[PDB]
Amino acid sequence: GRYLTDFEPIQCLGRGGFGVVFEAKNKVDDCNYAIKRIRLPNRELAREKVMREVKALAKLEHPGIVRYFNAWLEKNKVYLYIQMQLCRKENLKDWMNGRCTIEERERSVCLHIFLQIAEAVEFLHSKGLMHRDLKPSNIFFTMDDVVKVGDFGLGTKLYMSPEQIHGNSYSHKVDIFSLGLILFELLYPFSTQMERVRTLTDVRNLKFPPLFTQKYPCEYVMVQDMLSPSPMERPEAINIIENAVFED
Ligand SMILES: Nc1nccc2scc(-c3ccc4c(c3)CCN4C(=O)Cc3ccccc3)c12
Secondary structure, three states: OHHHHHEEEEEEEEEOOOEEEEEEEEOOOOOEEEEEEEEEOOOHHHHHHHHHHHHHHOOOOOOOEOOEEEEEEEEOOEEEEEEEEOOOOOOHHHHHHOOOOOOOOOHHHHHHHHHHHHHHHHHHHHOOOOOOOOOHHHEEEOOOOOEEEOOOOOOOOOOOOHHHHOOOOOOOHHHHHHHHHHHHHHHOOOOOHHHHHHHHHHHHOOOOOHHHHHHOHHHHHHHHHHOOOOHHHOOOHHHHHOOHHHOO
């Protein structure tokens, strides 16, 4: 089909239960792209849902949202292709892994990163959309270093709000919970992978390393709020963006 004819596959970038993402070079324009292939549901109503979802996402233009290029269908069982700007190999998880000391995690740089994520989320919320899948392995950097919120719309539960885990009804407030943990994680580097999971699961339960609360008193209170078991109590993305910790 169009994919094999117009593109040269380079490598596989990711494989969820949803679909697959490939790096592919367009033969005509010579640029490399990230192309997600999704198996389309056989049922009529489920297909219409997905096709409306595509039409909503295609309208999205924001500094913190990956640039969209094209979407199309191909028959084998039908597949939906979505062609997006190719971000860097190193995602936010990799970024944090390569910087394991306090000196390597400068306050300003970390907050500038978090702010861009938070602004992308605020933009989606204001449109009536939620992200649902905010985690460091799904947060990207463009070639020119702009932070991008990852794949969404159509893995660990470590960043997933309690209500979202339990299959309970939920709102945009789920993204705020995810934001809290990411803010903590940006400011608190880890020696080992096991320390990371040990500490993060505690932070989910509102139990904080005493060195974090003393070094980051303001953002501690903020993270505490964003991590309420009760979604109503979590602040709006706009409130977080306008918080005093992002003054300068
Ligand atoms: N863009 C990417 N660059 C490098 C590696 C990877 S791994 C996954 C992606 C990626 C990122 C974002 C998105 C996708 C793959 C598919 C759809 N999409 C979105 O952000 C959703 C969206 C679709 C259409 C318009 C706006 C947003 C990736």
